[PDB]
Design a protein around this ligand. Sequence first.
Ligand SMILES: [Ag+]
Ligand SMILES: [Ag+]
Ligand SMILES: [Ag+]
Ligand SMILES: [Ag+]
Length: 302
Amino acid sequence: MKVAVLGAAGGIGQALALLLKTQLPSGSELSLYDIAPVTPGVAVDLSHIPTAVKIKGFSGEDATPALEGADVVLISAGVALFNVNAGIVKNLVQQVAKTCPKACIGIITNPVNTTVAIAAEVLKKAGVYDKNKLFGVTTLDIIRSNTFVAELKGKQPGEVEVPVIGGHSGVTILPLLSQVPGVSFTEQEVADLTKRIQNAGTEVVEAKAGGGSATLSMGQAAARFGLSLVRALQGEQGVVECAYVEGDGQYARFFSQPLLLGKNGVEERKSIGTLSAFEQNALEGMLDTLKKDIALGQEFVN
Ligand SMILES: [Ag+]
Ligand SMILES: [Ag+]
Ligand SMILES: [Ag+]
Ligand SMILES: [Ag+]
């Protein structure tokens, strides 16, 4: 199995590449690509870590050498936004559609609500789009929910898993706090937890005082989703992760929901389950923003 990360020189890419080099199963290959000429040296530096993962870096305009034989392509390039990131997403996904068109594509570049629709429209212009292979990485909302819920209820952070559906934008992030096993929240606890999970990025941008956004936890989030897909792509069963994908269309063309992952991408789109009165109201009131964020990306290509 080979994983290619596009945007490896940035803060998210280097954290992503570091965690993958350490956590990818033995015999895996890791290709790093970015425009900055420092990228081959990022791989050389990571190549000194004693894990059975082959790593090589590439720079320049052409990402093809890094995409050769890629099973998973994680795109973390761009700034941490539609103005400057729409062109980078369209450019990189274009090269993916020519080199490894049947790879699993994970969009980390934000706004994920919009850039995944750009990637899909670019992929279908190449006659290549497979809605089972394109994922918007929303895992940062998952791990942020686990940290806040565990701190509130005094549980161990690694033993708390809350499902998050909807989109990646603030109002679109919907944590299903009613579905957490063994935990119950008051109606005010749900309100405070939901708003903190929806504004958790501003919490980091504010504390950094303009020096950047969440770059290490986002790398940790992209690494978790990357290894989950590699496990599924290796025949591992029961691998369930929530990701922003094009599915039923019951709420929007693209919607983050539980996904049973198999050897060809998503195996089954599991239901979002039973929703509380609060979660149902938040889902409906958010839909208008999600559809506009999707329409923005579709019109950019069309
Ligand atoms: Ag794949
Ligand atoms: Ag796939
Ligand atoms: Ag979820
Ligand atoms: Ag999930």
